[PDB]
Design a protein around this nucleic acid. Structure first.
Ligand SMILES: [Mg+2]
Ligand SMILES: [Mg+2]
Ligand SMILES: [Mg+2]
Ligand SMILES: [Mg+2]
Ligand SMILES: [Mg+2]
Ligand SMILES: [Mg+2]
Ligand SMILES: [Mg+2]
Ligand SMILES: [Mg+2]
Ligand SMILES: [Mg+2]
Ligand SMILES: [Mg+2]
Ligand SMILES: [Mg+2]
Ligand SMILES: [Mg+2]
Length: 82
RNA sequence: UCUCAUGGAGAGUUCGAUCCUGGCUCAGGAUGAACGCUGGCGGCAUGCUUAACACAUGCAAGUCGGACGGGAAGUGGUGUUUC
């Protein structure tokens, strides 16, 4: 049995005045399963609840969490710029 | 006495009576019928003949994304699919 890396995919919900955030997990043969539900920014703390859900799960390595937090920070800053 | 024929009826009224010419009237069918009285059901039909007179409202001709450029719904994104 080899070692498969459960790579995580980042998703967003684009609303008029709001934007939500969610994460998925991907393993070979297991396909894709949702890791986290959609958190609506600015109304809720989206990046904070996403990284809190990635910390509560011990099987997420620091690198996979920090990459998704970097591109999700780039999308929250891109929404805030608009 | 083979064959064809499945078809044609009258009545009252002019005269004191009659025969005739002659009109009127009636008995029969048919309705895209109307009105009156009365009206239980089913089957198949029929239903502005008058003003080709006016029209409130709603519907009666669209379809093709496999001609085509686009944008708008979602989706995580041009992998899916819709309008
Ligand atoms: Mg006379
Ligand atoms: Mg007399
Ligand atoms: Mg005569
Ligand atoms: Mg008759
Ligand atoms: Mg009646
Ligand atoms: Mg007419
Ligand atoms: Mg009209
Ligand atoms: Mg219609
Ligand atoms: Mg189609
Ligand atoms: Mg179509
Ligand atoms: Mg064609
Ligand atoms: Mg396509």
């Amino acid at each position: 049995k080899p070692m498969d890396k459960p790579r995580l995919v980042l998703k967003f919900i684009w609303m008029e005045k709001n934007i939500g955030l969610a994460l998925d997990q991907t393993i070979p043969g297991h396909g894709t399963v949702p890791l986290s539900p959609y958190y609506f920014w600015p109304r809720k703390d989206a990046w904070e609840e996403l990284k809190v859900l990635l910390e509560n799960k011990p099987w997420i390595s620091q690198k996979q969490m920090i990459i998704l937090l970097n591109q999700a920070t780039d999308i929250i800053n891109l929404w805030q710029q608009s």
